[PDB]
Curated annotation (Swiss-Prot):
Domain Peptidase C30: 1-301
Cross-link type Glycyl lysine isopeptide (Lys-Gly) (interchain with G-Cter in ubiquitin), residue numbers: K5, K90
Active-site residues annotated for this sequence: H41 (for 3cl-pro activity), C145 (nucleophile)
Cellular localisation: Host cytoplasm; Host Golgi apparatus; Host nucleus
Species whose genome carries this gene: Severe acute respiratory syndrome coronavirus 2
Modulation of this protein's activity: Inhibited by pyridone-containing alpha-ketoamides compounds 13a and 13b. In turn, alpha-ketoamide 13b (tert-butyl (1-((S)-1-(((S)-4-(benzylamino)-3,4-dioxo-1-((S)-2-oxopyrrolidin-3-yl)butan-2-yl)amino)-3-cyclopropyl-1-oxopropan-2-yl)-2-oxo-1,2-dihydropyridin-3-yl)carbamate) inhibits SARS-CoV-2 replication in human lung cells. Inhibited ex vivo by michael acceptor inhibitor N3. Inhibited ex vivo by compound 11a and 11b.
Function: Cleaves the C-terminus of replicase polyprotein at 11 sites. Recognizes substrates containing the core sequence [ILMVF]-Q-|-[SGACN]. Cleaves and inactivates human TRMT1, preventing tRNA guanine(26)-dimethylation of tRNAs. May cleave human NLRP1 in lung epithelial cells, thereby activating the NLRP1 inflammasome pathway. May cleave human GSDMD, triggering alternative GSDME-mediated epithelial cell death upon activation of the NLRP1 inflammasome, which may enhance the release interleukins 1B, 6, 16 and 18. Also able to bind an ADP-ribose-1''-phosphate (ADRP).
Parent-protein residues present: 3264 to 3564 of 7096
Residues in the Cytoplasmic compartment per record: 1-301
Taxonomic lineage: Viruses, Riboviria, Orthornavirae, Pisuviricota, Pisoniviricetes
Descriptive protein name: 3C-like proteinase nsp5
Effect of P132H: In strain: Omicron/BA.1, Omicron/BA.2, Omicron/BA.2.12.1, Omicron/BA.2.75, Omicron/BA.4, Omicron/BA.5, Omicron/BQ.1.1, Omicron/XBB.1.5, Omicron/EG.5.1
Effect of M49A: Does not affect ability to cleave and inactivate human TRMT1
Catalytic reaction annotation: TSAVLQ-|-SGFRK-NH2 and SGVTFQ-|-GKFKK the two peptides corresponding to the two self-cleavage sites of the SARS 3C-like proteinase are the two most reactive peptide substrates. The enzyme exhibits a strong preference for substrates containing Gln at P1 position and Leu at P2 position
Amino acid sequence: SGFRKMAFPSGKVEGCMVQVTCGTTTLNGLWLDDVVYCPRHVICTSEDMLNPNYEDLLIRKSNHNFLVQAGNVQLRVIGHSMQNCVLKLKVDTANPKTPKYKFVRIQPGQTFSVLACYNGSPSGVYQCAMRPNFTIKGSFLNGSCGSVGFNIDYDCVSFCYMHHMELPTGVHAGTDLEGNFYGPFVDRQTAQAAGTDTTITVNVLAWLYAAVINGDRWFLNRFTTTLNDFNLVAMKYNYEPLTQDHVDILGPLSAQTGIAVLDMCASLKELLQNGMNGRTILGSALLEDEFTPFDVVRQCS
């Protein structure tokens, strides 16, 4: 019983976090085998941040310009190279704690765990969701650049995000482990802002299934709707369209609970049109959209 925003256990990632210093800029890196990954803007200075030419900035550096610290052990850099917006720092020692791992890019609407780190040292772990507009609503303070986001499956860590910057609404932007930004964001000072966002409909429905699995049934009703007329109401409340694939993915939950997907949609339609009238669902007074069908199945079922 119960439902919480649950993150993956972080040990496997914690053993990969290091501190990378260059000039007076210090931030976090990820140490896998004999490579350290970090945001390339570690090579920047404040007065070249408006319009930096990273290729020029990097060609002017030597391996000894990069201090890498793994706890108390200093790691000797024996090479460096740029891959898109990350820097790969070759070091002389393979990380003995390297887990089995993969670099995966995630989709908007998918969730992951973030290990917030400062000066190479982990601070906390929380669950996140990639918003439709390719930002994340993280919790990050100065110096959290380089903290990573990940998923764990059968002992293998799929790294999907490295933190790079905070946008003006206080939401966050980063790239995947190959250095490619999520969204239309760049690592330089511009007017760039988060675009408009939508609510992740399939997650909201998954979450309503979780609730039913946990005994919250007040919002259910005997009605059913077509996928077309549901999406008519969705598009009006700034919800993403629902698809047959969404319905298929919701299958396992629908069958476990006995509530057909389109029946639950009738519930959602009602909730959007009249609010909750002072009631809560799974401890929340608003529709939660940062729980995938996978997440629910993992916690419930």
